[model samples]
Each structure stands twice: as structure tokens, then as C-alpha cells.
Target chain A: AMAEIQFIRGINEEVVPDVRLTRARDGSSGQAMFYFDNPKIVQEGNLEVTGMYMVDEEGEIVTRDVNAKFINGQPVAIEATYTMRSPQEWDRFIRFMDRYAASHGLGF
Target chain B: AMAEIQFIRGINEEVVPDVRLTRARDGSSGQAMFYFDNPKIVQEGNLEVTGMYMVDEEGEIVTRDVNAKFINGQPVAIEATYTMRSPQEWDRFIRFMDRYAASHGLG
Candidate 1:
């Protein structure tokens, strides 16, 4: 199957230097999660996202909400469906996923 | 048994106008939950507290951490053990709880 590239941009940018994004597994399905370097600021509503998106089953990019779980001002995990918006964004997403997968031995 | 006066003052003061304080239940075991008028600020760590406390079984005021669950910056609810600290604080807590209890029919 062709990769349906998508990008969930604003969040990463808003919390860029402060947060790390990765995938988390809930049984067979995996969701994206963000790890905040400081944790507390996120709980304080510091991140600003303009619009959020994901790649739908038809391989079309669509808007969606990013749900997250916070424990004492620190996000323990997060889940969102994403789709690539631009080639640059796609490349960035793939590079991130690949690095994350390899580091965790989860494979690309 | 006499009421063990204790105070978990910082949280309410910190979030003040933006959040409300109330007692919530975990079935038979009750906990305090904070309902942030604007949930996102809390998830963003906007509230600050120097000390957290609870009324323990021995009727003693003890310090503890407040554990909260956030859904998109708004806290759906919260859980913590608390003891009234002052007559003013106690009055406020009782009034808040009474109102909360009656309104929710959770009594």
C-alpha cells in the first residue's frame, strides 16, 4: 500500500524545543504521544496549535483533534491520527518516525 | 468524632477565579476534584501550590500531591484528600461541598 503522508504540524511547532513526540502501543494499535521536557508548562496551556490534521483511510488529509493525558501538569501520553501536508513536512514526519522506531526497536 | 481542622489552601488560591473546588466520590472512597472553569490552563501547569495536604485517618493534617486528570486543558474532575485549615477556610470548603453535594444529587 502506498504511504498516505500526513502532517499534524502546529503542536510540534508550538512545543518544539520543549517536547518530544513518539508512538505508543495500545494493543495492536499505536497512537502518537508527546513527552514534555519540563512537563509542567504543557499543563499550564503553553502550547498553541492553529489547526490539526491526519490522513484518512481514503488517503486524504483531514482535520482532527489531538487527545492527550496529563498527570500533574506533565503529559503522560497522547493519541492523534496524522497525514502529511507538504513534502518537507512528510520528510520530517518520516524521519521522526524512523528515528523513533529504530531507537525503540519497533521497526519503521 | 470532632472535625479535624486542616487546610489545603494553595490550589484554590492559585487557580482562584478560573477554577472551582469540590468533593467527589470514588464509590465509597471520596476524593476532592477541581473543576477548572478553563481546563486548558491547568493542563498547561498554570496553577501553582506550595503545599498539598489531606486529613489522614488519625485526624492529622498531612502533606500530599494532587493527582489530576486533564482532557484538553480542562480537567473533567480531580481527586485529593483534604482537611480544613482555618475557620474561614473550613467554612468555604463546607459551603462549597454542601452546594456541590446538593446540586449533583450525589448526596
Candidate 2:
């Protein structure tokens, strides 16, 4: 079974379920998959997700490159990926993830 | 007397009146003044103004450095300035102003 996580949509405060966050072994990049049972929530434009901590406390993660995979002509999964070119960028993301794990009761 | 112009706020579609757009003689920088008759509309966040085309057709001008001048505790005017450090940036602002002028019937 795949590990499931929850994410909140910043705009509407919608709770998105069954998300999976994958990271590179070197900690240089990462990707977040937001699985959707219904395709109606997936719209055209950048998706803003919050609760993932960054440098700015009130800033929401905005991703324009959202790719949706379809099964039987219906969108089943949407992916948003990000890369950290420098050590500082990776550090900020780690801080964000630390807070995220604490809030969601994820150990290690 | 200062030349007056009208600007539209993208958020609430409110028509902000008695505004001014001043540009540098060399076209390197510019400023837009948004005069407010009532101070209720001016909030503590970035002001988004539409109708100024900047490369993207649907993009709105967002300004975080909005300064308001008050006389005897009443707000009179607000200013937002921008600078074009490169030739390409200046070119884009020119294109935006060209469309803005055309739509507003301003010479």
C-alpha cells in the first residue's frame, strides 16, 4: 500500500487526501503528488497549496507545472515537482517538512 | 493643477479616480498615483491594479510598496513606483503603457 498524506488547498481550504511526497536521495529536489478521485477540483491555472512551511509563514506554495494523469479519460493523479539548486533552498524546504511532519503526526 | 487619470482595482472592480502616471524622461522608470477620496479602500496588503498590460494579457500590476500621504489624519494620495533596470524591462513597460493609453483615451 502507498503511503497517504493530506494537503490543504490555500484558495478554498479544501482538504486533498492521499498525497505522496517523494524526495531525491541527495535532497536536491522533491515532488508532491495530489491524488484526486474527482477531476472537477483540478482546474486550469496554478494550484496553491498551504500548510507546507517555507521562509515566509503566510506564503503558500504555488505551482504552475501541474501534470495530471488520466485513467479512462478521467484525471486520477496530479503531480507538482520542485528543485533546490542551492543548499539554502534545500534547508528551507527541510524546515517546512519538519513542521509538516509534526502537525500530521508523522514520525521520522 | 495636476493631470488626472482613472484606474481600476482588480480585486473589487472599484474605479479609483484622480490618479496620475508619471514616467522618466528617458523611459527608464515610472510611477502611478492612486488618489483616494475615502481611506477605507486602502488596506495593508499589495494592491492589484488591472488594465496595464505587461507582456501577459491577463496579468495585473501588483505593488507591495504603496505609500500613502496623509494630511491631518486623512489620506490624500497613494504612490507606487517601478524601475526598469534593463532595456527589455523598459520595453515591456512601454508596451503596457501603449495599451493603457489606448484603452483610457489618454494622449
Candidate 3:
């Protein structure tokens, strides 16, 4: 089973639910999908998303560049692609995923 | 006087205030500064910011590349640079600024 993740929307303090995070096995990059119940609730254009880590983690994983997905004129989900800007952040995120994977029983 | 702008921080629903938006005269690109009240309130990494448009506007301007500014080990503000991704978005942002400048009575 895929581990579920959640993201926080910046504008209205909405909790975007049922997200799935995928990453390259080599830890080079990652992507996240944020699902929505209604099309109207989805914000148009780019989105500012937070809460990319596990619940136990203190720091917030904030990201922009969330692309909205649509089907037949209705928004279905939003997606974000992540590339590590610095090596430190990359290492930290790898560690974060390590902890997350262990806790969620997910394998690399 | 420079017009002040506000950005919405994605985490914890904070209102980052006292922002200043500046753009080139030719409408090529833009930048904004998001100020904070205290250092502890500031997030350490890159920030996800929204609400980049004028108050009267309906659409939200979302950006992820907010860089933190610090002084004497105390966080003060965040900055985001805006480069148009497409000609259409560029024209829309330019038009948005035109309306904003007119409404505020200062450009």
C-alpha cells in the first residue's frame, strides 16, 4: 500500500488530503500528488503547499509550483515536483524520508 | 510612496506583512519582500507564499522561491523573485499591476 500524505494550502489554511509522495530510488528528486474532493476547492494557477513531512517532524516542508490536474473541465488534483536546492536540504530530506518510510512501513 | 503588499505563509496560516513589490519599468520582472514580526515566527527554509495580487483581485499569486533574510542572526524578511513563465501570464501580471497602480494612485 502507498503511504498517504497531506499538504497545507497557504491561501485559506485548507488541508489538502490523500496525497501520495513518490521519489526516485537514488534520492535525486521527488513528486507529490494532492487530491481534492471538489473542483471548486482547488485553487487555480500555482499553489503554495506545506506539510511535506511526517507528523512527528517539527519543520514544515514548503513548496510552490503545484500544478493543477483536470479531467473534463473539472479539477481533480494538484501535483508538485521537488528538486533539492542544496545538498544540506537534500540530505535532510533523505533522512526525513528514512524516518517516514520506517514509521509507515514503506520500502525504498 | 511604495505600495505595500502582503503574502500568506502556507504553514500555520500566518500573515506575512509589510511587503514591498518592485518591478522594472518595462514590465519584464518583479520582486516582493515579506516581513515578519519576530525571528522565531519565521520558517527556516524556502517558503511557500500566496496572495501576490492586489486586494481587489480574485486570483491568487502563488510562489515557492521565497528566500529568507536575516540580520544579526535574527530573521527579518523573505524575498521572492518573479520572472514571467509565459507571455500570457506576463501580460496578465502587467495588467494586474496597471490596475493596482491606478487604484493606489502611486506607481
Candidate 4:
């Protein structure tokens, strides 16, 4: 059994876009997306998170450092959305990556 | 600069829907969504995954054990999508959570 709450990590930062974290038992997992307000900036590896928070039972939202608190303090329940992307978004990502690969001499 | 590639994890199983990973260099990040073949089953808090894969330059799909590969073998590049949910999906999720909360006496 899991608590009724939603927690978020990496707001307005360049991090991996969609990541899934799951724990054993009941064999359940949730999905989440990282948002970077600035599209021009690209992070190479690993998520560089700037903030974290969780929605508690008391209707109060608490802020914490990355790695400070767990979602609802338990590993149960799925809390993420199935986001459908627009064509423009896909184009931008592809274009950005293509340029990156070329510059890095990936020899795409 | 990142690579033009996408990698995925936790398929056909219960796992966190999304967990983002980003490198610090260019300050860019991508987003992705997880799909469970079984809607009736719900994984709480964390994700329980079953498989992993990545799209390579050759357009061939590669499967790996958890933590065996990096997207394009590098931490650079954004390789996910922005998923939008439908109303029916939202309702289903809320209903699921409500039932879960009540059953666990999380009250």
C-alpha cells in the first residue's frame, strides 16, 4: 500500500527528460519527466537538479534538497504522466542532438 | 553537445513512469514516459522495471541488463519526449490512487 501524494524533482533544470524509478514488492513503478525551462541549454550526462519537493497529506508542499526526502517517504505507487510530444518538440530534440554529435566528432 | 540517440528502461513491468537523468555540461535534459502493458496493476512511489534498451546510430535496437549501457554510450543529449495525458487516463489514475489510499488506511 502507498500513500496518496506526488513528489517532484528537478524543476527548471537541464536533466534527463523521462526517467522511471521503481522498487520491488507489488512490482509497481511510477514515471516522471524532468523539465528545463530553457530549451537552448543542454546537459550532457546525468540530471543536474536544482530543487525537490513532495505533496504531503496535510496539503502542505515541502521543499527539500535532492536526495533528502523520498516520495511520500515510501517506495510504492506510480506518480508520473504519459506525456505526448508535439512534432516541433521532436524536431528540436533531434536537431539538437544531431548538431551535438557532429561537433563532438561522433561522425554521425 | 549530446548524441542523437534514445534509450529506455523498465518495460512490461511496474516502474516509476519517469525519472530524469541529465549531464551538467550544456545544461539540457530530455523527458520520457513508461508504459505498462497491464493497466490494472499499479506500482506505487518507485518503479519496478523488467527490461532496458537503446536506439543506436545504426538504427538497430540494443538490449542490455540494467545499468549496462548509457544512451549512445554517453551522458550527453536529450532523448525523451513530453507526454500529454488524456482525460480518461487522468480519471483512471485518480481513481486508482483514491482506492489505494483508502485500502491502506493511509488516512
Candidate 5:
């Protein structure tokens, strides 16, 4: 493994994902137990991929329908999949995912 | 490569996905030039994953943000990722992905 997450064992196994409330960073933010399904690391270098990836939160919390996985920051190659929402929501989500994916990388 | 599509020239590249309107088989359907960014085949067998995957259709038709990929039919290992469509929609999408994944495997 090239990079390591915030919390994991050797070989980037530790997945300590952090959340950021860009609007309110000072607000109370607790470490949430975001239970994610098995992330399938498709490619080995530069452009990494994990697809058909789904998740159900620890508390059965309501979830949004969008793909989530990190990319190789050191190296650069754009990668993506699809986002399904209502006509309106889909546009918004797509724009957000493309424009804000880098910021949300920490969420992964 | 493990396999090939019905229309691929070589290297399992030609992706001619078929859509079977199981419930609406009688309805008319055309060959839509669907647009998919790229499918990241994670693991080789049984299970697989591709994430942050997004697509914009060939037409201006509103898009849906969801993950799609195939699993190894040769072996059996249940694998998947998360689907987010609000509180209700997310649950529906996740459940659908699990149950419908195999059926939609052909498409």
C-alpha cells in the first residue's frame, strides 16, 4: 500500500477517517463509527479504484446515495463512477462530488 | 483478462451492456449509448469494488449517482459498498444493490 489512512494497521489497513464541517470547524465533532463495507482496491498505483462499494452506518443512520473512496494524492489521474439522484439532486450531487471530492477525501 | 463482453473486440473492453426489462419486456427499447466513466475492477474473483465512481449519460437526461460493477460468478463471496439516497432512498438503494446485483449482472 502506498498511503495509509488515519487509523489502521500496517499496509494502509488502519482506516481512521476524519470529518470536516468546513462551515463550522469549531462545532463539536465526535469520532463517528462509520461502518463501511469491504473497500475493494482495484488498481495498485497512481489511480486507485473501489466500486460497487456500499455502506450501512453503525447506528443504522440515514445514508446518502453516492460513491466514496480516496485517490492517490501524490500521483494524479482522474477517476469516477456515477451518482444517481433526482434530476435536481443528481445535478447538485454530481457537481459537488466533482468540485468537493478532494475535501471529502478525509471522510473516507 | 477473465472474460469478454458480447461485443468487445478484445481485452474485455467492448462494453455492450444489455437491459432486460424483466417486468417491462414487451415495451420498446432502443440501444442507448450509455455513458460510464470507468469501472474499476477491484479484486479478481468472487468479490470486487470501485468507488467514487460517477457517470453522465450520453444525453442530457438527468443522471443518478450510484455505483455499478460486476462480481465473480465463478465463486461466491458476498461483497458490496454503500449507496446514499437520503434516509429512505439510501436503504432502498443498498437493499436493491444486494438483491438486484445478480439479476442486473447481465446488464
Candidate 6:
């Protein structure tokens, strides 16, 4: 589950032209694309991102920062449609990482 | 490798006004943009898409159709660049799936 979301580390960005049709093809039947600032990588073929939020003017939707293993290793970026339901759960994760960083004397 | 490609199914499209910037920030280092029609879903948190190519006068570089597991589920879509190189290999996959589809006798 993604903890309370707050920061975004944009790695890649793209625009899928046929939104509705694509969703239909994938069977996201009643769902919509929830935007992310950029997702953070957690492991190979897996990334941790903020909740999927629409890019409506709710004041930048959401934001958060998390360290990615691949990101630190190479120059790579891309975006994909993620099927997520718990967009707000990231906050707990944010606080957890923050404390860990502080223990290591890593500035927030 | 993505074998000889033939089709694309677009999901969501957006123009990155900051293409060069994005690549730099993420460390694509010197890679240029490669376009795709749309990607097909294979599973949760996973999708199999055609190779990444750029938009140019090459007369639509590549195209292929693959059955996505998710497209059959909901109204979901978005576009993210794919880091792919085996693009041409998708053709081999196409043939493989074709055989499977034919076996099932379902188009």
C-alpha cells in the first residue's frame, strides 16, 4: 500500500492519446488514469508512486520524494498507467522514511 | 528482443514539451524518444508493449497487436515511455501468439 503521498520525483513522462479506448481494452472499465508527479523505483520492474490522482487543480494533486534503486544507478525514465486504489496510504510511508533518514543523519 | 513489430494500440497520449529535459533528468543520457501506438496489459503492475520508436517520416516505424489482460477489465489508460530494445523481436512473439490464438479458435 502507498503511504501518505507528499513528494514526487519525476523520472519519466508521456502522453497516451487514446485514453478511453485504451482503458476499455485493458478492462479498467470504470477507472480513470490517476496522475503521479513521477514514480520512485523500489525494485526491478517495480516502482512506488504517489496515489493515482487526476491532474485537476486541487493544487498540484499530490507530491512526494522517495529514493529509487535504479535511478541512482543509471539514466532511465518512463511513465505507465498504474492500477491503484489506495492513493492516500503513502503518508505513513513518508513519515517512516523520514525518520529513517534522520537516524542516518540524512537531511529531509 | 521485440521481434518484427506490426501494430500499436494507444492508451493515452501526451506531448512532452520537455522531452530532452526528461531524458536528461532520468539518465537516458543520449537516447532519443521512440513512439508506440499503445501498450497491452499482461497483469497487474505489468504490461507488454511494443518497442519504443520516435515519430518521423519513416512511415510509421512499427506496429503489432497483443492481447492485454487488463483492457478486458476497466476504463483505465495512460502513457509511459518504455525502455525497450528487442522491438524487432515482437514479431516473433506475434507469430507465437497467433498460433496460440488459432489453437483456441478465438479471434
Name the best candidate (by lDDT): 3
Residue-wise lDDT of candidate 4 within B15-70, one digit each (tens)? 22222322333323222233322222222313432333332222322323333213
lDDT of 5 by residue, B1-107 (tens): 02222111222222222211111112221111222223223224223332222111211121232234434643212222232323343233223322322222220
Alpha-carbon RMSD to native, per candidate = 19.8, 20.0, 19.4, 17.8, 20.1, 17.5
Indicate the residue-level lDDT of A94 in model 3.
45
Give the fraction of reference interface contacts each candidate recovers.
0.00, 0.00, 0.00, 0.15, 0.00, 0.00
- Global lDDT scores for all candidate models: 0.33, 0.40, 0.42, 0.27, 0.24, 0.27
Residue A34 deviation, candidate 6, in Å?
11
TM-score leader: 2
lDDT, model 6, position A15: 21
Across B18-68, the per-residue lDDT of candidate 6 in tens digits comes to 111112233222121222223233223244455333222222333232222
For candidate 1, the per-residue lDDT at B30 reads 20
Chain A TM-score for predicted structure 2: 0.49
Error of 6 at A61 (Å): 3.5
Model 1: per-residue Cα lDDT over A54-89, one tens digit each: 322233334365555566875653434453333344
Task: In model 1, state the lDDT of residue A62.
Answer: 41
Question: Could you tell me the lDDT of residue A106 within candidate 5?
Answer: 21
lDDT (Cα, 0-100) at B28 in candidate 5 = 20
TM-score of model number 4, chain B:
0.25
Give model 3's docking category: incorrect
Regions of candidate 5 where Cα sits further than 4 Å from its true position: A1-108, B1-85, B105-107
All DockQ scores: 0.01, 0.01, 0.01, 0.09, 0.01, 0.02
Taking the tens digit of each residue's C-alpha lDDT, what string does model 1 give over B6-101?
A: 223432222211112221111111223333233233444454533343222333344354555567875553334444333344334444433322
The CAPRI class of candidate 2 is incorrect
Per-residue C-alpha lDDT of model 2 across residues B37-73, encoded as one tens digit per residue: 4433444324433332122363444445455667898
In candidate 3, stretches whose alpha carbon ends up further than 4 angstroms from where it belongs are A1-5, A9-58, A106-108, B1-107
Estimated TM-score per prediction? 0.19, 0.31, 0.29, 0.23, 0.19, 0.20
